[PDB]
A paper describes a structure:
The parasite adhesin P. vivax Reticulocyte Binding Protein 2b (PvRBP2b) binds to Transferrin Receptor 1 (TfR1) and Transferrin (Tf) on the surface of reticulocytes, which is critical for red cell invasion. To further elucidate how human mAbs recognized PvRBP2b, we structurally characterized several antibody Fab fragments in complex with PvRBP2b169–470. We were able to determine eight crystal structures of PvRBP2b169–470 with antibody Fabs with resolutions ranging from 2.45 to 3.45 Å—PvRBP2b-241242 (3.15 Å), PvRBP2b-258259 (3.05 Å), PvRBP2b-273264 (2.55 Å), PvRBP2b-253245 (3.45 Å), PvRBP2b-237235 (2.45 Å), PvRBP2b-243244 (3.35 Å), PvRBP2b-251249 (2.90 Å) and PvRBP2b-283284 (3.15 Å).
Interestingly, 3E9 and 10B12 shows steric hindrance with 283284. 3E9 shows steric hindrance with 241242, 253245, 258259, 273264, and 283284, while 6H1 shows steric hindrance with 251249.
Residue numbers in the entry:
A (entry chain B): 6 to 46, 49 to 139, 145 to 224
B (entry chain C): 6 to 218
C (entry chain A): 172 to 462
The structure:
């Protein structure tokens, strides 16, 4: 079936231009009506565009939105202008079939857009070693900006018992989270454990092994 | 500009219960409503469109009702895989307006936390800062008191607590507390303890370590 | 009878059905629905003009052809009221059997007009059919053509089907056929027991009108249910992710023709609904005039 993949620049200085793009896999980016929704902690509908000729934006941000469809590159892009802190949200693109049937079946994974002039910072990954019922190890991802950062384990091989906590905003302004996992204590002696940390805005990719 | 409002904003129910969220429209919107489900850190998933049509593969317990002004989504047999925030969206006019969302917190039987303490990794102490972390694994409810005692002395103003969303497999939370002490402040003391307090624990349990051993 | 739009005719092969309501042909709803399919394929985005240069030209010629028969339609409507209104019947100077002979002659002449003046357009329908088969060939895919649009259009069609009250029509037409023949049998007994022929002829004639419109209601109801049941089956059945282009062509023809039948029957069932509602109010009133 048709899939949606969104790519763009998350961190943004104010007054810049939020520019995103969604590439369609499994289907052509043509007659379908492509929507854009943003979510701030709710769901705000930005605009809808179609190759047919129907393009409608939200009146609250109509004077700043630009949309386009590229049938050759199988892509469609959204654009925001005069960006401020009020535009800090997770941006999704979705597919609508017709202008009267606007339920959105596929969503992109979103691009967390943060509007700030603070320079981006790379996280530090420190292990939370297990000591000696069930053992508990983890990784500490501290001091980074901006959000987000993805933490996995064994390149996705270890999944059960894994927990990834929200990043508490420290007083320094940098974010910090911890990711742990509960494993049998007998697995400590022979089975290795490595966490995979990915902070895309800083391009940093760290893979730290957790050994007691 | 149609204003969609859904109630309640928060909802708590049992494991085998049946809940019903309602969505009211500012103006008549015929039968053009899409119901969504959004899990934490994910994208909204389509459940029901056109008030009554079920999306393919979606569990049949999700029920859609309503036409014109008022509507209602009904989960008929709850399941820990349904802890999410559900929305309603209309598409009779532009702009498309979304509902406020309805968080569905599932209630389960009480479970005591599994306490673990982590000393600051020798890597971080070389950077002039020390982070000792305590973990509470799989507990219920979310309310829990964590006290940090360093060398028999409770502390305040240096802990940061973060708790995960309600789990989708067992509906249990997890909390991590982190003391960010300067290496000098850390290098002076020797005993660091994590004192937790929960409804499931008869006696408040405490896990600790001794610095350097 | 305020309107006599309930008359239709099919070709001698019983393949092309012509109605007095736009677009008169299901094939135009097919072609109209192809304007949706062609929008999703950038490979064939040249049909926006073909729909305007050819499909609209075929539709414009179809509307003009029906208008030519309007003068013949006004003649039938005059004979309708003389035969259904006994008060108006008592003014003319011929028997009821003589007025039936003028009715059947004028009715088939009007029905024959709709077919005769549209034979040039019915041959044009197959022309755009081959153009659609040829236009769809320009898809760059050959062996792994996408089927997402094919099922996405079924998602749209099944939504429109829920707006169609098929269950209410079935109970409506079931009561109607039950009320129709029940009143016909009551007239069969009274026929030889009283002496008011002029009013009885108005009953039997309006009964004949109802019987014909009931036939049109039953046919359009079954064709709607068939399109609804078949399109629904394609959504509940297998869902191949990618098929060949020749396999994809008949897919568009399969659902594009079925949805044309549904929208065609939706226009006819609505019109046949009020026609039966109006014609039954004549018989019920005409029986009240008998007591």
């Amino acid at each position: 079936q048709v899939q949606l993949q969104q790519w763009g620049a998350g961190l943004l200085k104010p007054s810049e231009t939020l520019a995103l793009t969604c590439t369609v896999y499994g289907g052509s980016s043509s007659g379908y009506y492509w929507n854009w929704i943003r979510q701030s902690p709710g769901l705000e509908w930005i605009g809808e565009i179609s190759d047919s000729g129907s393009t409608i934006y939200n009146p609250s941000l109509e004077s700043r939105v630009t949309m386009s469809v590229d049938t050759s590159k199988n892509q469609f892009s959204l654009k925001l202008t005069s960006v401020t802190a009020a535009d800090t949200a997770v941006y999704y693109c979705a597919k609508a079939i017709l202008t009267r049937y606007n339920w959105l079946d596929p969503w992109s994974q979103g691009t967390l857009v943060t509007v700030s002039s603070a320079s981006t910072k790379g996280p530090s990954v420190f292990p939370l070693a297990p000591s000696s019922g069930t053992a508990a190890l983890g990784c500490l991802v501290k001091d980074y900006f901006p959000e987000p950062v993805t933490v996995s384990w064994n390149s996705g091989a270890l999944t059960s018992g894994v927990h990834t906590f929200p990043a508490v905003l420290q007083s320094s302004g940098l974010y910090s989270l911890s990711s742990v996992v509960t494993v049998p204590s007998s697995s400590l002696g022979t089975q290795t454990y490595i966490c995979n940390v990915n902070h895309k805005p800083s391009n940093t990719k760290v893979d730290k092994k957790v050994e007691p | 500009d149609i204003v969609m409002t859904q109630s309640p904003s928060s909802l708590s129910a049992s494991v085998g219960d049946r809940i019903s969220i309602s969505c009211r429209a500012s103006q008549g919107v015929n039968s053009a409503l899409a119901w969504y489900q959004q899990k934490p850190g994910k994208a909204p998933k389509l459940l029901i469109y056109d008030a009554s049509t079920l999306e393919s593969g979606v569990p049949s317990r999700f029920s859609g009702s309503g036409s014109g002004t008022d509507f209602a989504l009904t989960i008929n047999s709850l399941q820990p895989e349904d802890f999410a925030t559900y929305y309603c969206q209309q598409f009779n006019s532009y702009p498309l307006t979304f509902g406020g969302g309805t968080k569905v917190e599932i209630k389960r039987t009480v479970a005591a936390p599994s306490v673990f303490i982590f000393p600051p990794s020798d890597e971080q102490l070389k950077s002039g800062t020390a982070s000792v972390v305590c973990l509470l694994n799989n507990f219920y409810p979310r309310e829990a008191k964590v006290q940090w005692k360093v060398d028999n002395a409770l502390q305040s103003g240096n802990s940061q607590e973060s708790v995960t969303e309600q789990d989708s497999k067992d509906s249990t939370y997890s909390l991590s507390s982190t003391l960010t002490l300067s290496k000098a402040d850390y290098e002076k003391h020797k005993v660091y303890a994590c004192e937790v307090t929960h409804q499931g624990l008869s006696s408040p349990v405490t896990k600790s370590f001794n610095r350097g051993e | 009878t305020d309107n006599i739009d309930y008359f239709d005719i099919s070709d001698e092969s019983n393949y092309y059905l012509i109605s007095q309501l736009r677009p008169h042909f299901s094939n135009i709803y097919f072609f109209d629905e192809f304007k949706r399919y062609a929008s999703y394929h950038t490979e064939i985005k040249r049909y926006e003009d073909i729909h305007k240069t050819k499909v609209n030209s075929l539709l414009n010629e179809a509307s003009r052809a029906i208008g030519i028969c309007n003068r013949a339609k006004n003649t039938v409507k005059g004979l309708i009221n003389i035969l259904e209104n006994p008060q108006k019947f008592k003014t003319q100077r011929e028997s009821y059997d003589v007025k039936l002979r003028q009715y059947e002659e004028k009715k088939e002449a009007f029905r024959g007009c709709l077919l005769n003046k549209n034979r040039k357009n019915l041959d044009q329908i197959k022309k755009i059919n081959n153009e659609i088969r040829d236009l769809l060939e320009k898809l760059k895919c050959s062996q792994d053509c996408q089927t997402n649009v094919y099922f996405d259009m079924i998602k749209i069609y099944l939504v429109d089907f829920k707006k169609m009250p098929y269950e209410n029509y079935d109970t409506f037409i079931k009561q109607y056929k039950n009320s129709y023949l029940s009143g016909v049998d009551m007239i069969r007994k009274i026929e030889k027991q009283i002496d008011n022929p002029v009013t009885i002829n108005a009953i039997k004639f309006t009964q004949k009108e109802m019987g014909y419109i009931i036939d049109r209601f039953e046919y359009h109801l079954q064709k709607v249910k068939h399109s609804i049941d078949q399109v629904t089956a394609l959504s509940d059945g297998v869902k191949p992710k990618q098929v060949t282009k020749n396999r994809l062509k008949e897919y568009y023809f399969n659902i594009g023709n079925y949805y044309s039948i549904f929208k065609f029957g939706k226009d006819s069932l609505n019109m046949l609904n009020k026609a039966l509602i109006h014609k039954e109010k004549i018989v019920h009133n005409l029986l009240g005039e008998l007591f």
